[PDB]
């Protein structure tokens, strides 16, 4: 008998508390308690619904035709985009037309190109004939955008000039660092004397074997200096060489001074920035050709900046060609063929070896400092 289900409907709205459900077929099993509860002989306690309805009930007893041709999501994104400028959209269409770069970085122009008007949207805006004030801020911004002749070309000039300036200021000091790196690698002063000391100790060590009696090595042998460990497994060969060089010939301690421009390597891949620079120069040439087909206002707005960008990227391509020529010189310098990676492997090699030089210097200084401290402690315990 469904005695618990027989409930009068309350006239007020009641708070809904959450709990999980069990189904009805699982409910009325014979060994379940609900076979006994559904019997009339069960002790049915009647609660006071009036006091609970006093307590736990709820205390709660234009121009919408904006005629927007967009959907909700793109209008929402364009409203978020429009509200960042803290000004009217008339000023926005003004500095789109006037050619200003102060308030437009790469991401804002990327968002603007990602919220371009579509063909049916432009057709619905042009077929519109009623009052312009009835439209949304999004549609009025699109009408102001369509009022600008060749607006997409101007936004592309904004995006490509700002991106070209950013890529030039990123790539040009690093390409100068690569040029200074390979120039200092081609002409180094104490690096022959360091190789003199290394090959003197190495030809002393591997006597009487098939690996002995050599008169040179590649630059990768500078990585293999760290693989050497002593009987204590604490002193490397590089530690012993710098410890002897600190006593005998300290000019090798000025060895990172000539090679500080090889330090930090390139840290990049040169083909990625070269492809990006070539793509940017191709896009600048295409944009200059498109502006040349456009009106003279766009010409006086953009042609000097496009020519400066094309000149700077041409100087960058000349610098890349110089990097290629010095790469061939560095391949012949270390006597390795040019088909293998002799540019990024050599810079990562030199950055790794200079970090090995700096840690070997500071660990030799720490070893001498702790030896001096232990000697002072021994003299202390001998005094006392």
């Amino acid at each position: 008998v469904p005695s618990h289900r027989r409930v009068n409907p309350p006239t007020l709205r009641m708070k809904k508390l959450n709990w999980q459900k069990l189904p009805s077929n699982v409910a009325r099993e014979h060994n379940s308690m609900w076979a006994s509860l559904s019997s009339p002989d069960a002790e049915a306690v009647e609660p006071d619904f009036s006091s609970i309805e006093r307590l736990f009930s709820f205390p709660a007893a234009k121009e919408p035709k904006e005629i927007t041709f967009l959907d909700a999501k793109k209008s929402l994104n364009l409203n978020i985009f429009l509200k960042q400028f803290k000004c009217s959209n008339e000023e926005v269409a003004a500095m789109i037309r006037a050619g200003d770069t102060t308030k437009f970085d790469v991401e804002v122009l990327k968002q603007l190109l990602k919220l371009l008007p579509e063909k049916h949207e432009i057709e619905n805006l042009r077929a519109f004939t009623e009052e312009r004030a009835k439209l949304a801020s999004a549609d009025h911004f699109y009408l102001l955008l369509l009022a600008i002749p060749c607006y997409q070309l101007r936004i592309e000039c904004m995006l490509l000039c700002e991106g070209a300036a950013a890529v030039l200021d990123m790539v040009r000091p690093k390409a100068q660092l690569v040029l200074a790196a390979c120039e200092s690698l081609l002409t180094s002063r104490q690096l022959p004397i360091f190789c003199q000391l290394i090959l003197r100790i190495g030809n002393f060590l591997n006597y009487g074997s098939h690996t002995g009696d050599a008169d040179g090595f590649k630059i990768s042998t500078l990585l293999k200096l760290t693989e050497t460990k002593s009987q204590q497994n604490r002193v490397t060969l590089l530690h012993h060489v710098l410890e002897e060089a600190e006593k005998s010939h300290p000019d090798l301690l000025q060895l990172p001074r000539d090679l500080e421009q090889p330090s930090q390597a390139a840290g990049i891949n040169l083909e990625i920035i070269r492809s990006e620079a070539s793509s940017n120069l191709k896009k600048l040439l295409e944009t200059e050709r498109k502006v040349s087909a456009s009106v003279a206002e766009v010409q006086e707005q953009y042609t000097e900046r496009l020519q400066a960008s094309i000149s700077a990227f041409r100087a960058l391509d000349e610098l890349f060609e110089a990097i290629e020529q010095k790469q061939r010189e560095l391949a012949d310098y270390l006597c390795e063929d040019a088909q293998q990676l002799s540019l990024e492997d050599t810079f990562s090699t030199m950055k790794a070896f200079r970090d090995l030089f700096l840690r070997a210097l500071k660990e030799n200084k720490d070893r001498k400092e702790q030896a001096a401290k232990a000697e002072r402690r021994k003299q202390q315990l001998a005094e006392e």
């Binding site: 809904k16 709660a60 409203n79 978020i80 960042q84 804002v108 949304a136």
Partner: protein
């Protein structure tokens, strides 16, 4: 109808009307209870001070924070915080105003159920919304994509988001923020002989953390400068008239944000947490995220955090692509500013959570509606 934006943060509750630039009611979230006895009969000796009255009368009060590590622990206190910020500060009826609310990422679901049921059953509203704090912090910056690091009072969490799509797996959370820096400042101030043990003194240590502390650009050079010369020592006047002078503690206190081993945590600094957040994303969208690092929360008010953060990210990441830090001066209220931007839109009228939706779907439609 003017909506209400009410960021119920761990540190300070920031509430006001939508469509405005600055929040009207900014006040810390503490409940003060008198530990002593009353002898002076009458004059409204009310037993639980909430808000700025707890701040002003703090010398006789035990202060309890209802929010601990971005989790609403004490619920009666947090209801008193909501009652004070609706009735005493804004002085508005909740039944005639929508109320935007904020939340921390990776929150428990039953926590959202509980705030939804208090915001629909006790304080009845026509509509309300729950949003991620980092997403509103990004919307204050006006860009659609980027990574937002938010360091509140209990949580420093990283959320990268690309075109509004918040990546769930690349969100993570580090429990090291302003209260832990305050406790470490109590621990290191006893080296100079200044003792602060009471909860009343936590406001004083939080105040000197707000006023005098700053992020060092390099920790070792600032150590050598502080050890060499006493040029960086700064004085503070206590409310009892005593004047203290602190030295290296101006930069040893935010350095826990970059070195969590000071307070004894195995996890790395916020730069490494940002980096590991970036590697969890897809490799194509990382270029957008590296140039769009957005700070929010008042723990980024230290005036050396941007250049040090740029240095740490540029050192740790590969240097191929652009590193740019977005640190607006009003990023302390960027959660509230982004809520005011989001609440005042014509498209937002259909993402409101109405009373009828609550009656249909319990306090559970916020899971399937919001992210």
């Amino acid at each position: 109808t003017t909506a209400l934006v009410c960021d119920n943060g761990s540190g300070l509750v920031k509430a006001g009307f939508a469509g405005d630039d600055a929040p009207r009611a900014v006040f810390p979230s503490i409940v003060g209870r008198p530990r002593h006895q009353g002898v002076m009969v009458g004059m409204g000796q009310k037993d639980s001070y909430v808000g700025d009255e707890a701040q002003s009368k703090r010398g006789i009060l035990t202060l309890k924070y209802p929010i601990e590590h971005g989790i609403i622990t004490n619920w009666d206190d947090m209801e008193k915080i909501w009652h004070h910020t609706f009735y005493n500060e804004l002085r508005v009826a909740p039944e005639e105003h929508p109320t935007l609310l904020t939340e921390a990422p990776l929150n428990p679901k039953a926590n959202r159920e509980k705030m939804t049921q208090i915001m629909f059953e006790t304080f009845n509203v026509p509509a309300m919304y729950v949003a991620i704090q980092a997403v509103l912090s990004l919307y204050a910056s006006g860009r659609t994509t980027g990574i937002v690091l938010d360091s509140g009072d209990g949580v420093t969490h990283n959320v990268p988001i690309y075109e509004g799509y918040a990546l769930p797996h690349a969100i993570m959370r580090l429990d090291l923020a302003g209260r832990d820096l305050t406790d470490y400042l109590m621990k290191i101030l006893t080296e100079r002989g200044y003792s602060f043990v009471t909860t009343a003194e936590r406001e004083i240590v939080r105040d000197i953390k707000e006023k005098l502390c700053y992020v060092a650009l390099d920790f070792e050079n600032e150590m050598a400068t502080a050890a060499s010369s006493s040029s960086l020592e700064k004085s503070y006047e206590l409310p009892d008239g005593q004047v203290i002078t602190i030295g290296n503690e101006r930069f040893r206190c935010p350095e826990t944000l970059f070195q969590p081993s000071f307070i004894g945590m195995e996890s790395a600094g916020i730069h490494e947490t940002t980096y590991n957040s970036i590697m969890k994303c897809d490799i194509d969208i990382r270029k957008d995220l590296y140039a769009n690092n957005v700070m929010s929360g008042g723990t980024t008010m230290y005036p050396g955090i941007a250049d040090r953060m740029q240095k740490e990210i540029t050192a740790l990441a590969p240097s191929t692509m652009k590193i740019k830090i977005i640190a607006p001066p009003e990023r302390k209220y960027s959660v509230w500013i982004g809520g005011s931007i989001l609440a005042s839109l014509s498209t937002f009228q259909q993402m409101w959570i109405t009373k009828q939706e609550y009656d249909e779907a319990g306090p559970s439609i916020v899971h399937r509606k919001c992210f």
